[PDB]
């Protein structure tokens, strides 16, 4: 170590020639493969590749769909990858007309299998779900390939276009009149304990609050009826041991001015969505509240 070594500012990652160019220059050998520029070499987002059967890929052809991993309770597929739209079928929050529309969209054996597996078991819904991230690609086929980011912005190969996050309009939720400049977005699953069986509500919440306790206090204010239902079931129906009235999972952050309303088209049917233009994913785990 010496003074000049300390003074020297670090090398620019962009002005050093890459390893392949280094080797070719060292031997002074030509190659057919273009090598001077490496694509995705400066993508800071972390991505993964997922295989999914043809029946499940609908409304996820467009980039920006939220991707969930669901448990089948079986050893043959073990896990399936489904979108928030498919969960729209099961959620009580979604209206009748939209439910009919996106139920007519998912008329495939795989989607119906997913629904049967979801309703079959005795567990609560959130125990069967694991969130992966947002998708931005599609290669269609009998088995389709989806690439999903799990930490970062949504953009194509050259960053020449940034993708948004699409939320169906019935699931979108806000609790403040004037938005804070920075918004955090959360996934909420809340259970209503009626007589026969629990009806789950599914929401995506955009909020300025980052503290857990304040956020959960606001949520308990907004969902008082479901807490009353939880206590009522605890009283009337012993030997049923419910847990939780709802769970909250954090996934992402975006600016308030990026929020917009839009529609999605698939097989000449229009679904209306809320659109988070420059959304960047940052996943948390399910935290439960009562």
């Amino acid at each position: 170590m010496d003074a000049r070594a300390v003074a020297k500012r670090p090398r620019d990652p962009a002005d050093e020639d890459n390893e392949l160019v280094t080797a070719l220059k060292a031997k002074r050998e030509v190659n057919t493969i273009s090598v001077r520029y490496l694509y995705h070499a400066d993508h800071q987002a972390l991505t993964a590749r997922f295989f999914v059967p043809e029946g499940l890929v609908e409304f996820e052809a467009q980039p920006g769909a939220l991707l969930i991993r669901m448990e089948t309770g079986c050893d043959s597929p073990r896990h399936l990858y489904i979108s928030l739209y498919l969960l729209g079928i099961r959620a009580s929050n979604v209206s009748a007309s939209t439910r009919c529309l996106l139920e007519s969209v998912y008329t495939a054996s795989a989607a119906r299998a997913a629904l049967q597996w979801l309703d079959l078991g005795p567990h609560l819904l959130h125990r069967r779900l694991e969130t992966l991230g947002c998708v931005k690609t599609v290669s269609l086929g009998i088995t389709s390939l989806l690439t999903c980011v799990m930490r970062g912005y949504l953009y194509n190969t050259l960053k020449t276009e940034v993708f948004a996050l699409m939320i169906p309009k019935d699931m979108y939720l806000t609790w403040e009149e004037t938005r804070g400049r920075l918004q955090y977005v959360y996934l909420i699953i809340v259970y209503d304990y009626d007589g026969p069986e629990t009806r789950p509500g599914i929401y995506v919440l955009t909020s300025s609050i980052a503290h857990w306790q304040t956020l959960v206090d606001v949520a308990r204010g907004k969902f008082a009826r479901e807490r009353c239902s939880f206590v009522n079931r605890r009283i009337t129906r012993p030997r049923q041991i419910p847990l939780c009235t709802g769970v909250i999972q954090k996934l992402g952050w975006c600016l308030a001015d990026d929020i917009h309303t839009s529609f999605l088209v698939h097989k000449e049917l229009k679904l209306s969505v809320v659109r988070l233009d420059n959304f960047s994913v940052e996943l948390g785990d399910f935290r439960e509240f009562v």
């Binding site: 050259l158 960053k159 020449t160 276009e161 940034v162």
Partner: protein, 49 residues
Amino acid sequence: MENWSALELLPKVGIPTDFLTHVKTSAGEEMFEALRIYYGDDPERYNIH
């Protein structure tokens, strides 16, 4: 409906503009057909096909 990317990429002739009102007021009050507004830097002009 208009090809805004072609407008951005192609060369242009510079003129002194003479809106009577504020340019954003002229846009907001719909002085023109075929308006487009964007803020900051929008990269969409770079994807030629």
